[PDB]
Amino acid sequence: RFLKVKNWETDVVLTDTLHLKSTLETGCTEHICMGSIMLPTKDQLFPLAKEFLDQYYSSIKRFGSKAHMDRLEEVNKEIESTSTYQLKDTELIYGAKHAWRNASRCVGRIQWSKLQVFDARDCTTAHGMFNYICNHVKYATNKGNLRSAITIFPQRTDGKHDFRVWNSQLIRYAGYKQPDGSTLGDPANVQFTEICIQQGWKAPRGRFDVLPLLLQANGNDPELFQIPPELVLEVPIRHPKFDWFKDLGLKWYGLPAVSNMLLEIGGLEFSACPFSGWYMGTEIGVRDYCDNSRYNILEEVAKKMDLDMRKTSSLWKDQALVEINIAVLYSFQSDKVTIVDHHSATESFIKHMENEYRCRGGCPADWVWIVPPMSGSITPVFHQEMLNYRLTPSFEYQPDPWNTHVW
Amino acid sequence: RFLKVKNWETDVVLTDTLHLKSTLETGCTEHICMGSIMLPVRTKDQLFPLAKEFLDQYYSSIKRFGSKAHMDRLEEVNKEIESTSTYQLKDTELIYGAKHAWRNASRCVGRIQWSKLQVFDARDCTTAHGMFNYICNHVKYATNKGNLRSAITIFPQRTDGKHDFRVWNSQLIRYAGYKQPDGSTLGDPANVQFTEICIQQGWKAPRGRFDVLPLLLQANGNDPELFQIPPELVLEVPIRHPKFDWFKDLGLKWYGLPAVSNMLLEIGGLEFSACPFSGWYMGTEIGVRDYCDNSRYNILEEVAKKMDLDMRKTSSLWKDQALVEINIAVLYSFQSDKVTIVDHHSATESFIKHMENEYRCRGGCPADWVWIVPPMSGSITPVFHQEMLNYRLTPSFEYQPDPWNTHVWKG
Ligand code: HEM
Ligand code: HEM
Ligand SMILES: Cc1cc(N)nc2cc(CNCCc3ccc(C#N)cc3)ccc12
Ligand SMILES: Cc1cc(N)nc2cc(CNCCc3ccc(C#N)cc3)ccc12
Ligand SMILES: C[C@H](O)[C@H](O)[C@H]1CNc2nc(N)[nH]c(=O)c2N1
Numbered sequence: 001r002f003l004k005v006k007n008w009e010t011d012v013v014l015t016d017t018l019h020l021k022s023t024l025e026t027g028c029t030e031h032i033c034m035g036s037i038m039l040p041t042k043d044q045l046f047p048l049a050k051e052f053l054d055q056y057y058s059s060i061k062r063f064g065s066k067a068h069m070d071r072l073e074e075v076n077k078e079i080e081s082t083s084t085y086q087l088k089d090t091e092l093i094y095g096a097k098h099a100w101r102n103a104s105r106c107v108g109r110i111q112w113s114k115l116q117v118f119d120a121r122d123c124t125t126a127h128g129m130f131n132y133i134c135n136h137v138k139y140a141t142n143k144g145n146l147r148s149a150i151t152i153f154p155q156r157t158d159g160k161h162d163f164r165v166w167n168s169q170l171i172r173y174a175g176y177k178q179p180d181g182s183t184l185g186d187p188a189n190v191q192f193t194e195i196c197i198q199q200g201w202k203a204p205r206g207r208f209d210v211l212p213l214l215l216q217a218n219g220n221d222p223e224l225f226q227i228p229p230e231l232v233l234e235v236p237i238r239h240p241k242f243d244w245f246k247d248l249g250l251k252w253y254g255l256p257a258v259s260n261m262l263l264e265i266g267g268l269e270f271s272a273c274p275f276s277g278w279y280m281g282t283e284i285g286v287r288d289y290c291d292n293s294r295y296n297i298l299e300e301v302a303k304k305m306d307l308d309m310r311k312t313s314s315l316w317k318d319q320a321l322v323e324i325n326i327a328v329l330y331s332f333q334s335d336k337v338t339i340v341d342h343h344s345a346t347e348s349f350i351k352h353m354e355n356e357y358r359c360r361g362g363c364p365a366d367w368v369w370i371v372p373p374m375s376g377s378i379t380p381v382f383h384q385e386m387l388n389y390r391l392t393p394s395f396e397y398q399p400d401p402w403n404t405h406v407w
Numbered sequence: 408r409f410l411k412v413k414n415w416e417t418d419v420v421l422t423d424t425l426h427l428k429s430t431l432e433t434g435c436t437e438h439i440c441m442g443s444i445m446l447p448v449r450t451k452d453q454l455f456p457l458a459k460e461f462l463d464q465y466y467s468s469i470k471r472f473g474s475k476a477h478m479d480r481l482e483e484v485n486k487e488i489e490s491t492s493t494y495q496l497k498d499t500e501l502i503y504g505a506k507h508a509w510r511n512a513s514r515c516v517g518r519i520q521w522s523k524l525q526v527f528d529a530r531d532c533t534t535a536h537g538m539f540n541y542i543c544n545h546v547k548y549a550t551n552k553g554n555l556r557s558a559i560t561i562f563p564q565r566t567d568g569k570h571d572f573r574v575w576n577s578q579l580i581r582y583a584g585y586k587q588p589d590g591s592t593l594g595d596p597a598n599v600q601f602t603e604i605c606i607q608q609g610w611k612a613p614r615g616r617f618d619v620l621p622l623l624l625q626a627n628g629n630d631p632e633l634f635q636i637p638p639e640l641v642l643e644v645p646i647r648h649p650k651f652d653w654f655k656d657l658g659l660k661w662y663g664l665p666a667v668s669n670m671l672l673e674i675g676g677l678e679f680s681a682c683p684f685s686g687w688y689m690g691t692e693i694g695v696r697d698y699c700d701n702s703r704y705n706i707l708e709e710v711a712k713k714m715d716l717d718m719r720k721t722s723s724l725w726k727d728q729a730l731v732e733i734n735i736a737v738l739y740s741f742q743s744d745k746v747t748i749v750d751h752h753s754a755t756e757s758f759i760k761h762m763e764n765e766y767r768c769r770g771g772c773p774a775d776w777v778w779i780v781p782p783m784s785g786s787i788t789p790v791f792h793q794e795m796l797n798y799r800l801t802p803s804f805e806y807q808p809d810p811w812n813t814h815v816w817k818g
């Protein structure tokens with residue numbers, strides 16, 4: 001019941017008690033581990049509100065206080081009256097920061113307490129939503145000195161009045177299928193790109209076309225808006241040894257900002273809550289560029305390097321993968337756009353784990369996701385045992401809106 | 408109940424029914440996943456269902472389920488259990504069990520080979536010298552002058568747990584580690600404790616960086632004895648790089664035959680505490696883990712220096728760049744010397760095909776993603792993108808305590 005985790009590189013052992021707080025289910029059982037699977041009312045409301053307010057008030061050292069009890073009463077009466085309830089600014093902020101703190105798949109969590117929270121709960125329209133997002137994008141980009149942020153739109157009421165951002169990320173490249181069967185641009189976004197065009201977007205049918213926003217307010221039909229280009233900071237990718245590398249014509253955007261996740265705090269549901277930090281290099285260089293069902297550039301890069309691509313055992317893919325990732329880090333650092341290499345990030349995460357075990361009794365973590373997609377065992381996290389469990393408040397996945405939308 | 412797994416690179420979806428056969432436990436609960444945890448005397452009471460389950464499987468595989476030979480075999484084993492409190496496997500059953508323990512090994516990426524396994528029956532062995540002889544022949548057969556052949560040698564099963572056969576080495580062939588007065592480590596740091604034991608047991612250590620350890624062998628629960636593997640039986644490979652001529656001056660070599668000797672093989676409830684088995688290496692085992700783990704030979708810096716990389720900032724990925732060249736060297740050296748090895752691309756790709764075949768013919772293939780994915784270049788191999796389901800099937804290979812912590816010393 002008191003679980004131990006070991007680092008096999010250092011023999012450091014930590015004890016985890018925090019997991020006993022866990023409420024939600026993992027997908028695993030005593031008979032089967034699903035660790036590698038990607039996606040495994042009034043009466044419901046109050047214990048959830050109660051659990052949350054308890055931890056919030058414990059966090060501010062007023063557990064078992066009148067203020068605590070009063071708030072518990074006040075919310076309790078509001079749930080009886082209104083069915084739902086509203087979070088105070090303080091509780092909103094706490095909840096958001098803790099949703100991040102509890103995100104077991106995020107390696108960058110040492111930053112969790114330094115998060116700018118934009119309260120967009122006064123929003124009523126998609127234009128409103130567009131304005132709020134533009135401000136988010138500008139604030140977070142900060143001329144390249146990125147700052148973590150989340151913008152939070154009104155909470156769910158009856159599911160028929162949901163606020164949704166339809167994009168998977170605020171900034172992402174379009175995906176176009178071709179008559180010759182191939183794929184131009186980002187294959188991951190082929191489908192959403194269609195939905196834009198189906199709804200009016202005039203694609204430039206390019207390779208690196210910044211998608212338009214598709215915003216849904218109050219459950220209404222979603223609308224298109226183009227983010228001012230001047231707010232979309234991008235980085236041309238060059239290599240610091242290979243001068244042919246620029247002719248590959250690659251670039252990426254600096255702001256990683258997820259917009260399709262659901263934020264849950266004290267039983268309340270925020271279906272529209274875009275959040276952003278800054279990139280770890282491998283996200284772009286390894287996954288975005290080298291994944292086969294993505295930009296898939298390994299071959300062409302290997303050819304330009306004139307590598308023996310006859311046999312897998314030359315490890316040509318491995319050589320190229322490194323170089324590509326060198327270039328990404330190089331390009332971002334040169335243009336002074338914040339980025340972190342997989343070595344620095346995982347090192348930081350170990351320190352964070354140790355802080356969390358010491359000051360919280362543990363830190364939920366998904367090794368499958370925390371270990372970078374390259375050079376796994378030369379990063380410290382590979383040798384680090386982790387316990388995965390679900391803490392609330394949380395970020396959760398949610399269905400794509402187009403499958404659900406009563407037009 | 409049916410369980411679906413998805414490959415996110417191909418959209419290929421597979422349905423698992425085999426997990427329904429799984430009896431043993433994972434460590435996980437509906438409230439916690441322990442999938443990255445490394446490690447999460449039997450009565451006649453609990454022995455027959457295990458025998459029966461096994462024999463039911465065995466006879467199904469040979470399409471004689473419910474046959475008279477099946478039924479008589481069940482009766483025979485039952486009687487033998489209640490009479491003697493244990494039972495002996497037929498050669499056929501033993502072989503079947505060994506192969507299936509490998510088939511069921513969810514942490515093994517090399518399982519496409521599971522049906523080609525040379526089984527050596529050493530259940531007639533009685534002494535440590537007898538074990539030495541058996542182990543020598545295994546090494547010679549499995550090495551096959553570089554054309555490696557998978558093999559397992561099976562010593563007598565446990566009885567009361569007081570007459571256990573154990574091989575004290577973690578692998579049949581492994582390099583010594585020596586801790587020095589200055590705190591530094593000569594040789595393989597992973598083997599310092601075991602090395603110390605051998606020395607205490609009378610082993611005269613050369614004290615070099617690549618000394619093949621002596622065998623420390625325990626028969627019938629007696630104190631273990633030291634033996635030296637004839638050097639001519641130990642195939643080794645000097646590591647060089649196809650482009651970098653300074654690489655040979657690093658002075659690295661490794662042994663050709665990976666053979667684990669500290670695991671336990673369970674078959675129909677029977678426990679085989681000494682069952683060394685060997686296959687051949689995937690390149691990254693040496694090039695990534697053995698050479699480049701900080702707690703092992705830890706050669707990254709020296710290598711990156713010789714390549715003259717920018718080692719002042721990690722953002723150069725000097726470590727990543729060095730790691731690749733070393734792995735290229737290991738592959739290149741083995742291939743040049745015609746010693747069987749497989750790169751991590753070939754092996755993961757074969758495993759996907761194996762896995763798919765197993766879903767079709769068997770209804771599943773239990774797999775440990777955390778272990779299946781190679782320790783470099785993870786997502787450019789197809790297993791990274793493959794959802795897997797992990798669960799325990801018998802027959803199986805299990806971990807067991809190190810004998811030095813449990814052994815009762817005779818003198
Ligand atoms: C500030 C620097 C940050 C870094 C370096 C970072 C790093 C990462 C990485 C590498 C992943 C894996 C993503 C993938 O492979 O698709 C991830 C996932 C995630 N991050 Fe962080 N992140 C940062 C900021 C944030 C912030 C500000 C939040 C929320 C307020 C957050 C919450 C999450 C969540 C919920 C996931 C899981 C996403 C999913 O399951 O799809 N991160 N992060
Ligand atoms: C023939 C070529 C083979 C290859 C390429 C191969 C590959 C591998 C690799 C890379 C690992 C990971 C080990 C580690 O990272 O320490 C492993 C583990 C394992 N293999 Fe295989 N293997 C082969 C043959 C065999 C054979 C013949 C057996 C048994 C008869 C076997 C059973 C196992 C078991 C039980 C593990 C888990 C080890 C543990 O949990 O400590 N393998 N294999
Ligand atoms: C805050 C944040 C920071 C950062 N550096 N990177 C970040 C990356 C993400 C991206 N997570 C996407 C994970 C995913 C989800 C669904 C599918 C599918 N199909 C495939 C992959 C989100 C947030 C990030
Ligand atoms: C058949 C086999 C083949 C092959 N190519 N490689 C193989 C490697 C192994 C190696 N397993 C090592 C597992 C382990 C467990 C604990 C610790 C510690 N501390 C360190 C390592 C076993 C069998 C192999
Ligand atoms: C099958 C497997 O679960 C899947 O490919 C996971 C593996 N680990 C990952 N890790 C991160 N950071 N991001 C991912 O998308 C994935 N994908």
Ligand SMILES: C[C@H](O)[C@H](O)[C@H]1CNc2nc(N)[nH]c(=O)c2N1
Pocket residue numbers: 008382383384385386442443444445777778779
């Ligand atoms: C903590 C973690 O489980 C540990 O480092 C594991 C990870 N995956 C592994 N995978 C393989 N093949 N071999 C290993 O030794 C390990 N070690």
Ligand SMILES: [Zn+2]
Pocket residue numbers: 028029032033034035435439440441442
């Ligand atoms: Zn699990």
